[PDB]
Design an enzyme around this catalytic site. Structure first.
Site, mmCIF file in Angstrom:
data_model
loop_
_atom_site.group_PDB
_atom_site.id
_atom_site.type_symbol
_atom_site.label_atom_id
_atom_site.label_comp_id
_atom_site.label_asym_id
_atom_site.label_seq_id
_atom_site.Cartn_x
_atom_site.Cartn_y
_atom_site.Cartn_z
ATOM 1 C CB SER A 124 -0.884 0.010 1.248
ATOM 2 O OG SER A 124 -1.974 0.904 1.088
ATOM 3 C CD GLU A 125 -0.987 3.299 -3.437
ATOM 4 O OE1 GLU A 125 -0.942 2.079 -3.107
ATOM 5 O OE2 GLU A 125 -1.567 3.706 -4.472
ATOM 6 C CG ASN A 126 -1.424 3.957 3.055
ATOM 7 O OD1 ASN A 126 -1.472 3.043 2.235
ATOM 8 N ND2 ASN A 126 -2.054 3.905 4.232
#
Ligand code: EMC
Ligand code: EMC
Lengths: 425, 468
Positions: B291-293
């Protein structure tokens, strides 16, 4: 990640001529077993990206002894006569690159960044080029270093550096869970962390393999995604390069440099008089010492029982850490330094190590015992890039003439000139 | 680091017009109390560097409501009506910058790096420039975006981005020890970590202050040297933006995209059909979702009791994490993505060229919300990009055509197209190539619905589907 029970099997496919990233700072955090494995396979013509070359009989030095290295890309190659031998004889190629730059170029290589700018090395042979990368069979320079493009940003000059990537990375870590995640112990982190992200194939050796769940998700230093091959090291020689156990002209300078410290100050002190000056810091005054190999909160030299091979300072000496101290990687360490987060930096053909990075920031005061102040046995000079040298303090008993007599270039004299100061207690 | 008992006292000296870095991803890891403190002082004309704009009534949106923000530098600003109105009314300035780029520019700002190169945004308006940073009250363009310099390295094109620094940073963290060291909880890390190193004065708010020694020295996320001012937050609303709890044409594509997953694969899936496809992953197969976050090892949506505000996916949805998962900051997350460490990136899309170009994050006049991390996700050649979308448009228009009617995400970055009707392989030099056809359809049917021409694989087969 794939686990291997045999270290030679894990590095068996490294081709000759491959460029290999090798972790470690001095003898701290070096992948002993993987290096020993390369001795078995005998792979040669390697381009080794390693901060240092270990020592003559240990670490990367071993691959030099077996002459399996064609080129070394490092920041400091001192304390190794074999290197010097092969280097001068013109049988060994070597790119001396600033430590911070080396760390950042490696990170860029793993982050998808092909190039970036840094002021480290500006107005230096790093930038100007011409530096001997290789000598000929005698004493003539065969290969020279190419210049670094210069560019200005917000009124300051920086040079362009390119990403560094390897075919393989030989990394030393503390523990690995069964999923492949890894952690590093104390300052044995240094280059191992970033190198773990900049190679086609990364091989990690660990002292222990634990169960998934042993690590808090927030505390995994290297996520499994970066660990391609994992092996538990067979043996670990907790080798120490410089055991520093605890149990005048030089004195003047020290007692004066000690007056440069301030409460709540963050400083990086070079081994020698700078570091020695920290011993004269008022117990009421709080000074946080940073170490370029990844430490914040350096403590005193250890007692025989405190000694730890995973904990040393930039000068390669065994040390201790104080309460509230922290560890981090080499790239984070120089971001900290390059970024000018360190308030004071006091310092006194083997390489520049991290010296250029230490003086690379305009927000950091540089005191010599690029530069802001010069402290010596005879006097104290302030330095202004636009006005030049300016004697501000003179040792009681000496005259401006005495200084002039010993000083090379001319200098101004502050109408506030006073006798050199010294720490009371 | 200096400790404050009062939040307003910690931010009291912020000058009007100052640029302030504000941590947070969606409503995860936002410095509630420091933002509340800014409302008290009323500082204005601020240039806020924030990944998002929170929501209308929370996070950065609150400063928009009080109109204390002159300019916003972000990657995605949807879900905030006040933002949209102020921007269109020409009362708000905004620089939409790729998420990965934003994170890296901030890190650069803290690491002494003035500029660097990235392929993110190449062949895009990010590079082209000319976009409206600000409108005039009459609808004309008051301020336009400048182009980004382009340069080639090892045969690939990259653009030059400059470091971002702030006068102040408002950071949200989990704990601080009495020395000033701080840690972050789960995915609430995101931009807080790097923003903590890129400002003249950083202000950190924590939920709890512990004793020196509580942290293992190796596990201090932010060393005290970066923490100038520290304050314990008075109150904390564990606000959730999108509560996601667990208990057809779309189905075809899903059941086929599920076959793309491979054992031991690292993948990033966009919310929607791509994410939904992960549900059809053989329990014998192991897929690690990124997940990019800042998360590696995403799990299923939580049960009512599992719900945690510090844990959400890139789509702003509350999620869980599987064993052996890890959390890391936004700049590290995109270093991972940009460096091509993710094996498979599967996403949805509006259009795709016969060479890999893709459009899926903006619609010129009907959806100017920002590209988020979409451009970074297709920035690496080492990552296999797989697009999953319905074959045609409204009146049966073409989607896999010759050129991008809509703003590109990334030049020749797509590797495979999966649709209801067929499956195309994509080569940057050879172009489209039908490799699978839905049982019952003909090559003509495909040609009818498809935009630009395409080759046919001498190994063409009926479109595959998952099951036992
Ligand atoms: C250009 C001052 Hg070292
Ligand atoms: C050309 C790599 Hg998208």
């Amino acid at each position: 990640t794939k686990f291997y029970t045999d270290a030679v099997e894990a590095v068996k496919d490294i081709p000759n001529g491959a460029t290999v990233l090798v972790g470690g700072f001095g003898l701290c955090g070096i992948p002993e077993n993987l290096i020993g494995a390369l001795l078995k396979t005998g792979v040669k013509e390697l381009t080794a990206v390693s901060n240092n070359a270990g020592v003559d009989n240990f670490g990367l030095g071993l691959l030099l002894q077996s002459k399996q290295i064609k080129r070394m890309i490092s920041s400091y190659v001192g304390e190794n006569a074999e290197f010097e031998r092969q280097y001068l004889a013109g049988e060994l190629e070597v790119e001396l690159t600033p430590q911070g730059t080396l760390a950042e170029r490696i990170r860029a290589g793993g982050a998808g960044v092909p190039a970036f700018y840094t002021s480290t090395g500006y107005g230096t042979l790093v930038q100007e080029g011409g530096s001997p990368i290789k000598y000929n069979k005698d004493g003539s320079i065969a290969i020279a270093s190419k210049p670094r493009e210069v560019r200005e940003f917000n009124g300051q000059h920086f040079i362009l550096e390119e990403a560094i990537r390897g075919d393989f990375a030989l990394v030393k870590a503390w523990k690995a869970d069964q999923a492949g995640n890894v952690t590093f112990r104390k300052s044995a982190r240094n280059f191992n962390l970033p190198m773990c992200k900049a190679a086609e194939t990364t091989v990690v050796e660990v002292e222990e393999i634990v169960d998934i769940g042993s690590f808090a998700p927030e505390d995994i230093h290297i996520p499994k995604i970066y660990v391609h091959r994992l092996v538990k090291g067979e043996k670990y020689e907790k080798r120490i390069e410089r055991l520093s156990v605890r149990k005048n002209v030089r004195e003047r300078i020290i007692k004066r440099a000690a007056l440069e410290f301030e409460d709540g100050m963050y400083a990086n002190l070079g081994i020698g008089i700078p570091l020695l000056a920290s011993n004269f810091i008022s117990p009421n005054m709080t000074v946080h010492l940073q170490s370029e190999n990844g430490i914040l909160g350096l403590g005193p030299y250890p007692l025989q029982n405190e000694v730890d091979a995973d904990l040393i300072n930039a000068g390669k000496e065994t040390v201790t850490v104080l309460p509230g101290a922290s560890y981090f990687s080499s790239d984070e360490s120089f971001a900290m330094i390059r970024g000018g987060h360190v308030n004071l930096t006091m310092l006194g053909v083997k390489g520049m190590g991290g010296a250029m990075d230490l003086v690379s920031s305009a927000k950091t005061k540089v005191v010599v015992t690029c530069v802001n102040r010069i402290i010596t046995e005879k006097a104290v000079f302030d330095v202004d890039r636009k006005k030049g040298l300016t004697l501000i303090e003179l040792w009681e008993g000496l005259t401006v003439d005495d200084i002039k007599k010993s000083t090379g270039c001319d200098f101004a004299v502050s109408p506030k000139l006073i006798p050199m100061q010294q720490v009371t207690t």
